[PDB]
Design a protein around this ligand. Structure first.
Ligand SMILES: O=C(O)c1ccc(CN(Cc2cccc(Cl)c2Cl)C(=O)c2cc(F)cc(F)c2)cn1
Ligand SMILES: O=C(O)c1ccc(CN(Cc2cccc(Cl)c2Cl)C(=O)c2cc(F)cc(F)c2)cn1
Ligand SMILES: [Mg+2]
Ligand SMILES: [Mg+2]
Lengths: 214, 214
């Protein structure tokens, strides 16, 4: 069936996959398909505005180890600073919060993340597995927006794509939320085509293996 | 004791208090006291940037009745449009989501809302009461930012204050999240003074009577 909600998704972590990383930040931006299929008329901006009606969750997370120097430089986060801000680890309460947020969205749900198959999807699955919650998102679907945007269309970095589409760099905000918002803008460029591709290629989230095990 | 998290808070509703309104949108922006007491140095913008580390939740809610014409004009929401986007009502799952979000923040917690004593605080209490969750936020504190900003310092509308402080209008975004972000900016103008006032005047949320009953 047709996806009813696209949940644009990006996470920050302590390092790249080969480091056995942990989540430091996540952003979920849930957009109803109607915002892409049937956007309201206006009486012509370079970049489409976000829909008026969206659900957004952006959370920082205390990892169980230090971020690498390279990770801190690109994400703007460090374990020490997260601790100063009283952040809690990836725990049961966080999993419940994520599920409660997702349950506010009409199903089927599709997570959309840029290079999601390499980064966000396996890391989320690994974090859930460490809590013993291996099937918590079996009901979700997912797509990788790099796969989608390649098929619809070079560098396929988010910034490269955005610049090619809108003739300007995206906002200067090196955060999970900034990345989600820029991805949404890209997905609104040709929204009906994007949505058709997602509906045709959405994959069950349960097919995503965890990045790592115990 | 000193408040550890300030949660900037704004809601939209179907109408003004005298209409027996229901929530249509909410935004909670949780900021650790350290972001106000001990902001990092930089090597001088007109408006302070938001802290790198924040938690944000912005949700739309299906009310059980129509929004008034006046409400729709100022909020940009209507019950019909919320329904088209598949929004769910203010229910147990929403209350649990709010509590799970708040539980990620170090206590004591203080909600900060502009004219909160008139709008946001009694309406939140009314919504919780309708679910039979009358004590769910007894552990929280709250302050009304109009009271705070008057004491620290004319029109005390958010826009009027922002313009007086920063010499320019706030961003054009008539949303709960836009209002929270502008309130945060105002609170960052003299952050140590603001935080001292909040610590001295925070009130238990349980002292807030619901806007209305059954
Ligand atoms: O195009 C994208 O959206 C994108 C690009 C890269 C990353 C990887 N990064 C950032 C990062 C880049 C460079 C060097 C370091 Cl050291 C890092 Cl740490 C993570 O934060 C990241 C890592 C993961 F393994 C799982 C994950 F979800 C997130 C995430 N997304
Ligand atoms: O300064 C502020 O932040 C502010 C100012 C006004 C309102 C009231 N409004 C907006 C509104 C303004 C004008 C006319 C209509 Cl008809 C409306 Cl409907 C609500 O949305 C509102 C109503 C409530 F009763 C409880 C609440 F939480 C929210 C909220 N906040
Ligand atoms: Mg990413
Ligand atoms: Mg308000």
């Amino acid at each position: 069936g047709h996806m009813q909600t696209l949940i644009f998704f990006d996470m920050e972590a302590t390092g790249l996959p080969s480091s056995r990383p942990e989540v430091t930040e996540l952003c979920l931006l849930a957009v109803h398909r109607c915002a892409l299929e049937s956007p309201p008329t206006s009486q012509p901006p370079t970049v489409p505005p976000p829909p008026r009606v969206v659900d957004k969750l952006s959370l920082c997370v205390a990892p169980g180890k230090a971020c690498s120097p390279a990770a801190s430089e690109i994400t703007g986060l460090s374990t020490a600073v997260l601790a100063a801000h009283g952040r809690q680890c990836f725990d049961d309460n966080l999993a419940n919060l994520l599920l409660a947020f997702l349950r506010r969205q009409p199903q089927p749900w599709c997570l959309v993340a840029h290079n999601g198959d390499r980064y966000d999807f396996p890391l989320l699955q690994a974090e859930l597995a460490m809590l013993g919650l291996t099937s918590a998102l079996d009901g979700a679907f997912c797509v990788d927006s790099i796969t989608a945007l390649k098929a619809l269309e070079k560098s396929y970095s988010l910034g490269s794509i955005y610049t090619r589409l809108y003739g300007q760099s995206p906002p200067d905000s090196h955060t999970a939320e900034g990345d989600v918002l820029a991805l949404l803008s890209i997905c609104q460029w040709r929204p009906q085509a994007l949505l058709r591709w997602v509906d045709a290629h959405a994959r069950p989230f349960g097919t995503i293996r965890p990045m790592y095990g115990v």
